[model samples]
Target: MASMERFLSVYDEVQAFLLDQLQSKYEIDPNRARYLRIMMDTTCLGGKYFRGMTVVNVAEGFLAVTQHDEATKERILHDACVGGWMIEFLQAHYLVEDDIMDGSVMRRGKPCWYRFPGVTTQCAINDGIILKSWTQIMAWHYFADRPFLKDLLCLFQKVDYATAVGQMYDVTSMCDSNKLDPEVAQPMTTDFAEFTPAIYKRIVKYKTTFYTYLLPLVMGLLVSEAAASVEMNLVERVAHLIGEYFQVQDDVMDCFTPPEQLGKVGTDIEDAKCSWLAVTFLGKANAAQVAEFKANYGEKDPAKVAVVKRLYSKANLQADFAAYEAEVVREVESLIEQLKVKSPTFAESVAVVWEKTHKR
Candidate 1:
């Protein structure tokens, strides 16, 4: 089996290939093309590259389990790279548009894509669309004949539809405070009881998990011509479970992980965007903490930032997170156990999934 470092080394190579495609195919080369190029470079380089990692890991797993020939494995690897790059491309598409939507001035510790000299926000939006379109074209050209092309296409369409729905919900949720009713923003017991974590889970799953965790393996399975075995369905369910837990872990990191390791500073609290932590905090905050959070959490005032943090501290966010993390980890382990009856290839895929869950 390859070490984690070995997998990442492969990811770095594919990353370079992906970047070259982005430049050659999508670069406008106008006077300000440098700005778009820089943004793409930074955005592409800044991520953990876990999505891309899945591609290589899944291909490796398939080869190990199925005893495929070298040429076949290489083809699987190539197709898996396309599956992985498509995810990264979608992320870039979203990030560019998100920066403009949020009026963000910086991303990945540098200027937002739209903040470059002579680049208007509109251009960034258009660039995002182009990046997305280019991703589809690349996928079609590269993986057109992989045995699972139909399945791969179905997975891509499902993920895209789910993500679009989630994005729409997010935009609607963002406007809930202003357009619907300011009172709707307040966290309540009913919200926590039913859809609190679920809403956030769905958001993260559609936004990131579906493509990042499941698509790579499914794409590999498709490419390898793995049939819809009972084992395959089991694997899919397990993948979904792992994907959900992974997203939850990510949300927890966004709110509380150390800045040095996280790359981006925490902004869930300040942005007032719905997150699991925020919902959990809302469910538990005292009247004083509630008032403090309401008064300061999303406000632009710098001083309010400290107050909001203090309020979150008062709400015991870390303690709650410790308990929540343990629960999700347990669920993941249970799913893994259920998934163990499959091929060694499947087991290796599960290992990769766990590896992602445990990453810093």
Candidate 2:
């Protein structure tokens, strides 16, 4: 089979299992089951599937190094796919809620779930909750008897809670600035002074780091023979560093990358986001530059957006980003070097992830 097909076949299996559970086990009425099936397919399928693939790749990498029996290796691959799909489900749940909260119009070049025909915001909310519950149910069914199930369950719950807290911080930080409701068309706030680099780091760690970078790696370890042997603290520390750098890169891309390449129009500036660019520019701006920023930083007008872009250019934010990226690369390499002494497979897996994320 082609490599892409090998990776995505697991998604097909996950879909079948979900439908079987909904219809045969839960025994929902046909109408409700049909509705749920549509939501499940829409929410879970498509997208890049990066997290899912990461889970399988890391588990396979470790299994290869350890040279497990053929039967055991097959079992690990199947079960790891379950864990991977669970991660995908969790991500979809978050995206559904986040899209509604952000009043996002499009996702992945299509209408947001909340904007789907006949699907209101309330339906989207319920669907998001359902997606999360489905992940928990799948975990119980697949891994309930495993030796590391308790650890796995605890890890999932912890990451979920951490992500919610990060979302709270993200929303509240911008609450007093720009209103998400585009109909209001309110002016931007001059409270850019409040968004510090430290606060930015906190949001990135809790929101993007825990689940995106750390969870897949640790989940792979939990399923492997190294579950009881790996140094988890080191794993998390390294993952967090990579995750923070990834978010910073995303922030830079929001301004520098074209909409076609990014797959979405950049909204950070108009949304008055606590972006890396915004924070760095604030730190570097003179008094008059700060005044210019306050006037043109966060608004829907293209001209105002251009003004802010000019400010970023004047402050040499691109140069700053290049320096930051290099520093992050050095730090992650150092962490990976430290990790190699503890777990070579884990360290190599991190290296793979770093190369993929950094190259993009």
Candidate 3:
């Protein structure tokens, strides 16, 4: 893997490449082009860039062993950077629609694209679609002649469909309540018995894990032309485990962390989300405790929110989270050890992800 500086430089280059393509390859009025650029720049450029960095790092890790001239290496890194940008592009598109669906106001410390001044809600949907289309265009332009282009295309298609289905399950969960006018229902709550860990894991695997954890790593390997050398099943299993743990941590943070630190007000409760806290509390609480929980689980009232937090405190969920975190760390370490025998570089790559995501 290269230094942070190199990774960032490649990221900028990829951004430039996409902007140029939009300007020259597509025919559009200047005003439309300007708006499109703003959509791309603002939505895609921010964030930790964890996915993008993973793509570049994995490519560089694999290519380091092989003797390639500087130009060839640069070209490979450039392509991997494009792959990185694709992940960001997809994420940006997801956020655009997700914000509208989730009714999110703030993202990465700024208003969501849909809520931005002068951007009509309809325009935001079209903008998301445009962002999605650009991935295909960029892929075709850069990778059409490559041998793995078909495989790459298939991978992206499969991931996109899986994510959409996961999101469907989520939205359906939100809408399928017995309450009339589920869309307008405030502070919705699901019975703990109705929301099982299996269902939670399903949501995480498709909604978050596949794209967030597995896709970038797989894409990195594919772009490096090392498809045959990789073990798809093992890689996916490891990635899924890490991703599940990552999401569990996110769920915990939503309830426990402050809004300033979390970057947005926690809405899992208000949104009637199937959160880990709800599931854990359900498992431990007595009937009276459960009754109390049901009263405030999804209410928008601050007092209700306080009641829910007090229950979490009584249950000592923070202690449980620490224990679970330790268990997951052990599991990941064992998997990485097993992976080292087959592909040390890949093991090291997964370790990088584990380290970042495991931070407190």
Candidate 4:
């Protein structure tokens, strides 16, 4: 709601906090710190603020559950806003490094951190490190007086480590970039043998789920000092269910969505990466059907891509997705409802998160 507006006002504070800490706390050179500031601007700013707002919204729900007075709400919202920026910084860290690892050229409507004319891949990677290091420092500085400081820093490191491991699984599954003989090494491509729903779920949770869903939820709970193990366990449970479902929705969108609306055409087929459609087809298809899909999968030609689409039609992939979406929605909604008995505010927290994902 109005939280987006309030969350936005904190951007200046976050930037100023970084500028202050990098100079005074770390005692870096002014010019070098300014260079880091520009890197932050290039990589971190200008995205949709949805991720940042999730923290604000979840913390607000927890505030309501605890019935904190305005005095406390005011203080806690500040914490949430700064905490949300930590998520944004982590995202920046990942994006900078990912572009280097994936050899990505563009990000957020501009050249990537590594793509800057004089900035080598070395700088891109080192810049990513600087971006990530700021998170813990900011947590220490921003929430210094708060009792939840340990939880805040710990949640950040834990989720950050989780996301890195996710990237490990994701990148390696696509190619043998390491630990193989030169003659044996293969170019990066999707390994159909690795396309089980189980592996797909693992990729989804580690790569996308923990940091995207779990961190903000837990951050909010800790900010409110209401993160008892009982409450902690409940949010963690839904994070997996909801986080896995969120990836499903994204995979479905890449194939089915119009480029005019989504601003880019689907590349999962052309790239031959792991996807809901690819994994689903591999799961259900006969030998002939598999060969037909596989032959056309990674081609860049239009009609060849159409061959893969036709297999999706023959196998009814979109219909399966719709059915799966409905099933997951029903389950999570019921989970939220059950939560109503304990705290309606917590129920609202979970519902708002799911609604944002299923946005019309």
Provide the global lDDT of candidate 3 against the true structure: 0.81
Give each model a TM-score.
Answer: 0.81, 0.92, 0.92, 0.88
* Residue-level error in angstroms, candidate 4, position 327: 1.0
Q: Model 4 has how many clashing residue pairs?
A: 0
lDDT of 2: 0.83
The sequence of per-residue lDDT tens digits that candidate 1 reaches over residues 1-360 is 353455445445654555565568867354445554555565555666677667666666666657767777766766666667677777788788877887776666677778877567767778788667756776777767655666777787887777777676555443433345545564422222332666766666676666766766666566556545327666666667677767667777776677666656767656666676667777787776666666776556768867866666677778887787687678777766666665556666777668767765
Regions of model 2 farther than 4 Å from truth:
1-4, 175-189
Query: What is the descending lDDT order?
Result: 2, 3, 4, 1
* Candidates' C-alpha lDDT: 0.66, 0.83, 0.81, 0.80
Model 3's TM-score against the true structure: 0.92
Clash pairs of candidate 4? none
Off by over 4 Å in 4: 25-31, 65-69, 175-184, 187-191, 258-266, 299-306
Write model 3 residue lDDT over 46-83, tens digit each, in one string.
Answer: 78888878888888888877788888888788888888
Which 10 consecutive residues of model 4 have the lowest summed lDDT?
173-182
Q: What is the alpha-carbon lDDT of model 4 when measured against the actual structure?
A: 0.80
Q: 117 in model 2: Cα distance from truth in Å?
A: 0.5
Q: Alpha-carbon error at 202 in model 1, in Å?
A: 3.0
Error of 4 at 197 (Å): 1.2
